[PDB]
Design an enzyme around this catalytic site. Structure first.
Site, mmCIF file in Angstrom:
data_model
loop_
_atom_site.group_PDB
_atom_site.id
_atom_site.type_symbol
_atom_site.label_atom_id
_atom_site.label_comp_id
_atom_site.label_asym_id
_atom_site.label_seq_id
_atom_site.Cartn_x
_atom_site.Cartn_y
_atom_site.Cartn_z
ATOM 1 N N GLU A 116 0.841 -1.198 0.000
ATOM 2 C CA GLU A 116 0.000 0.000 0.000
ATOM 3 C C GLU A 116 0.883 1.257 0.000
ATOM 4 O O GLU A 116 0.727 2.171 0.841
ATOM 5 C CB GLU A 116 -0.996 -0.004 1.153
ATOM 6 N N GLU A 124 -5.623 -7.306 -1.525
ATOM 7 C CA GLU A 124 -6.326 -7.413 -0.272
ATOM 8 C C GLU A 124 -7.800 -7.060 -0.459
ATOM 9 O O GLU A 124 -8.107 -6.066 -1.125
ATOM 10 C CB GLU A 124 -5.798 -6.411 0.752
#
Ligand SMILES: OC[C@H]1O[C@@H](O)[C@H](O)[C@@H](O)[C@H]1O
Length: 314
Positions: free
Chosen positions: A143, A255
């Protein structure tokens, strides 16, 4: 058992070794409620064919270090599961608000920092190769919406960010020439975040094989945002189409997660996203009980067993 090909139906189970040590048990969701090892349970009852694992460099408690990652990756391999390795390039959690380089790297020259990053990647992949594991995918960062290893790898230092990215890419290909290298951002609903990063990489010769997204849309229901979680999912589907067209790279949903008590909605989200133009979907820590760690509630188990959420995968 043999590894599946094609669409990746995945789970991140990095917490599993810590949970086992702490004494958590997992059970089959059928009438028999048999106690079971968690990866085997996910494969046999939740249709999972792929496992994702995070890597931390010098973590205080040892979990997610190379050693721990080897254990879980060997277990995945033995059970016929494909593996994704996710390098955080931190001693702890890497996320959009927290991209701190390992404490041991903080006084290196930029040239030595690149070398330490490269050496970390290669040493982990080399150890995996030695024990019989070849990852199918590798993330270079986790991320990295604002960059990685801030401030040095900030998007505001596009040359330096790109150079760190490419050290990572090169290190993966060195050991694992066929591994797909993923750049993974959060907020898959948010085109702007993707434009900014991938235009930086375009402008500076950034190397990557695949674009990774996180999708956690339930906040929009809870905050009563017009359109609910469905709008966030539809905006994610639009963004998937957009980055494929603009950058010509495949997309992984690295995710995904919903509240453990939103079994039906979670099943529908995953069913919906399985028709999007992605190469797979990884549920993040599905086995984590409600409350785990800091109060985590986006698992998809209840009473120590899978809910119907991953019925999407079966
Ligand atoms: O405990 C669940 C964890 O979720 C991660 O993605 C986050 O970076 C951590 O700080 C913690 O919230």
């Amino acid at each position: 058992v043999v590894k599946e090909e094609g669409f990746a139906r995945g789970a991140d189970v990095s917490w599993l070794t810590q949970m086992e040590a702490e004494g958590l048990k997992f059970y089959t969701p059928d009438e028999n409620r048999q106690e079971m090892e968690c990866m085997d349970l996910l494969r046999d009852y939740c249709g999972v064919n792929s496992i994702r694992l995070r890597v931390w460099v010098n973590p205080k408690d040892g979990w997610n270090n190379m050693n721990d990652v080897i254990v879980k990756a060997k277990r995945a391999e033995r059970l016929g599961l494909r593996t994704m390795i996710d390098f955080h390039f931190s001693d702890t959690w890497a996320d959009p608000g927290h991209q701190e380089m390992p404490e041991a790297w903080k006084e290196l020259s930029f040239d030595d920092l690149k070398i330490a990053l490269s050496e970390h990647v290669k040493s982990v992949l080399t150890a995996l190769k030695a024990v019989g594991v070849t990852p199918e995918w590798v993330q270079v960062g986790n991320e990295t919406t604002p960059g990685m290893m801030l401030p040095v790898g900030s998007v505001d230092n596009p040359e330096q960010l790109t150079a760190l990215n490419n050290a990572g890419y090169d290190a993966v290909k060195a050991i694992c020439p066929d591994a797909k290298v993923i750049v993974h951002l959060d907020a898959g609903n948010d085109q702007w975040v993707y434009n900014r990063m991938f235009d930086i990489l375009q402008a500076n010769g950034g190397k990557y094989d695949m674009i990774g997204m996180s999708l956690y849309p339930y906040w929009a229901e809870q905050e009563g945002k017009t359109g609910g979680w469905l709008k966030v999912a539809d905006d994610c589907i639009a963004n998937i189409k957009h980055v494929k067209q603009k950058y010509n790279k495949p997309v992984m949903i690295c995710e995904i997660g919903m509240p453990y008590d939103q079994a039906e909605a979670c099943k529908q989200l995953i069913t919906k996203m399985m028709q999007a133009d992605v190469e797979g979907i990884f549920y993040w820590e599905p086995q984590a009980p409600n409350g785990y760690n800091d109060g985590y509630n986006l698992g998809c188990f209840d009473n120590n067993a899978p809910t119907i959420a991953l019925d999407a995968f079966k």
